[PDB]
Swiss-Prot record:
Gene label: CA2
GO biological process: angiotensin-activated signaling pathway; carbon dioxide transport; morphogenesis of an epithelium; neuron cellular homeostasis; positive regulation of cellular pH reduction; positive regulation of dipeptide transmembrane transport; positive regulation of synaptic transmission, GABAergic; regulation of chloride transport
Ligand binding (Zn(2+)): H91, H93, H116
Residue positions where Phosphoserine is found in the record: S162, S169
Summary of pH dependence: Optimum pH is 6-8.
Protein name: Carbonic anhydrase 2
Result of altering A62F: Reduced activity
Cofactor(s) the protein requires to work: Zn(2+); Co(2+)
Site (described: Involved in the binding of some activators, including histamine and L-histidine): Q89
Linked pathology: Osteopetrosis, autosomal recessive 3: A rare genetic disease characterized by abnormally dense bone, due to defective resorption of immature bone. Osteopetrosis occurs in two forms: a severe autosomal recessive form occurring in utero, infancy, or childhood, and a benign autosomal dominant form occurring in adolescence or adulthood. Recessive osteopetrosis commonly manifests in early infancy with macrocephaly, feeding difficulties, evolving blindness and deafness, bone marrow failure, severe anemia, and hepatosplenomegaly.
Residues bound to substrate: T195, V196
Record CDD domains: alpha_CA_I_II_III_XIII
EC number: 4.2.1.1, 4.2.1.69
UniProt-reported outcome of changing G141R: In OPTB3; complete loss of activity
Amino acid sequence: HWGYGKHNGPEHWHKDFPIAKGERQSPVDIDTHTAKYDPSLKPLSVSYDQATSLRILNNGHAFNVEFDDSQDKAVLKGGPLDGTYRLIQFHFHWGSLDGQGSEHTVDKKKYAAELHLVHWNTKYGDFGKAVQQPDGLAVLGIFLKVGSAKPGLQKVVDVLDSIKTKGKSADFTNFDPRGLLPESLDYWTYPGSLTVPPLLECVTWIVLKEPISVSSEQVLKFRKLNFNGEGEPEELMVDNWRPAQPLKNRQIKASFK
Ligand SMILES: [Zn+2]
């Protein structure tokens, strides 16, 4: 099936998903000297006070923290967006070593990891319908560097032992995703896609400038997960990032001077 290796990695994905070579693929390199400051961009509104996490899942590519998205609870609005987008899940991408792991890059710099908080446009009624629309998703992307521990992440790290292998899930209630946000909400934005198959071109990307710091111990626990299922040959869940894709006919816009 698709994955991150020699034989089924990103360089192969186009065979099953020809949109991989499309016009608006993600991630991309953010060239900070060309991104234009756009004074028409609004502050991002992140309203996560009523977020209801339900469960964490090892899907065989990453782990997903899932939310109850049956009501307007946890919503992203403003910024570059028109309307209201509901939080469905978050996950990460990370490396085997701290010098790689992010999907977006900044002037070619790779961070140790990248967090994606995935939200769908409530004008399309459900997630499956939204991913069929060019404005269906808003993904908030946050870089991770290694240094001080992020206290807000520790609940996530300490449940990973229980979801080591593909197909495992665990109850994961009352997790507050505000604890994963940096101080500033300054951002870059551009139109793009999901970074895993089916690679749909339905995302407004919002990539925060300011990384969060996590500890080496924290990221080390991400790297003990497994891509394989229970009892199969152990292949550590590392390097689950797609590299930068061509920018083509797109502009990256900065919310900040
Ligand atoms: Zn992602």
